[PDB]
A paper describes a structure:
PX domains have specialized protein structures involved in binding of phosphoinositides (PIs). Through binding to the various PIs PX domains provide site-specific membrane signals to modulate the intracellular localisation and biological activity of effector proteins. While all PI3Ks must interact with phosphoinositides as phosphorylation substrates within the catalytic domain active site, membrane-associated class II PI3Ks are unique in that they additionally contain PX and C2 domains appended to the C-terminus of the kinase domain. The PI3K-C2α PX domain folds into the canonical PX polypeptide chain topology comprising a three-stranded β-sheet meander that packs against a subdomain of 3 α-helices.
The model obtained based on the 2.5 Å data contains coordinates for residues 1421–1532 of the domain and an additional GSHH tag-derived sequence at the C-terminus. Residues 1490, 1491 and 1493–1496 were modelled as alanines since their side-chains were not clearly visible in the electron-density maps. This model, which we refer to here as 'structure B', was refined to an Rfactor/Rfree of 0.231/0.311. Our two new structures, A and B, are however not identical: they have two significantly different conformations of the putative PI binding region. Our two new structures of PI3K-C2α PX domain show significantly different conformations of the PI binding region. These differences are attributed to the presence of a putative ligand in the PtdIns(4,5)P2 binding cavity in one of the crystal structures. The ligand-bound structure exhibits an 'open' conformation of the PI binding region. Structure B has a more open PI binding site with the PPII/α2 loop and β1-β2 turn presenting conformations similar to that previously seen in the yeast PX domain protein Grd19p. The closed conformation of structure A is more similar to the PtdIns3P-bound Grd19p structure, while the PI3K-C2α PX structure B is closer to the un-liganded Grd19p structure. In structure B, the putative ligand appears to form hydrogen bonds with Arg1503, a highly conserved residue in PX domains. Modelling of an inositol ring in this site shows that, with minor adjustments of torsion angles Arg1503 would be optimally posed to interact with a phosphoryl group at inositol position 4 and that another residue from PPII/α2 loop would likely be involved in interaction with the 5-phosphate.
Residue numbers in the entry: 1421 to 1536
């Protein structure tokens, strides 16, 4: 797009600063820079990002977002490991979205500020 040239979920980990949950480490590569940046975002921030996109855009403009209640009974680390994938495909979908999605303020905010 503008600056952002590629994004990906690079890896994640199991934090305890309140109690849980996981953090997803997101690698971003901008046009104006040679080195990636990395930001850290939980499942619920990506959710909160989608929810705010829906306020201002029609859903058919946006990727679908990955949430299953519990598949059936599963499973701490296991869900983290399926989110690495699902969040990453969300991200690829969201940034090859129209320009007004890819480059809109709500999606640049999401991606500024390592922990914020």
């Amino acid at each position: 797009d503008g600056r952002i040239k590629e994004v990906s979920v690079f890896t994640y980990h199991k934090k305890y600063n309140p109690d849980k949950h996981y953090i997803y480490v997101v690698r971003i590569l901008r046009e104006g820079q040679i080195e990636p940046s990395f930001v850290f975002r939980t499942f619920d921030e990506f959710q909160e990002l989608h929810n705010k996109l829906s306020i201002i855009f029609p859903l058919w403009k946006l990727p679908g977002f990955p949430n299953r209640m519990v598949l059936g009974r599963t499973h701490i680390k296991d869900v983290a490991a399926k989110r690495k994938i699902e969040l990453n495909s969300y991200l690829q979908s969201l940034m090859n979205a129209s320009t007004d999605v890819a480059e809109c303020d709500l999606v640049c905010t999401f991606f500024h500020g390592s922990h914020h």
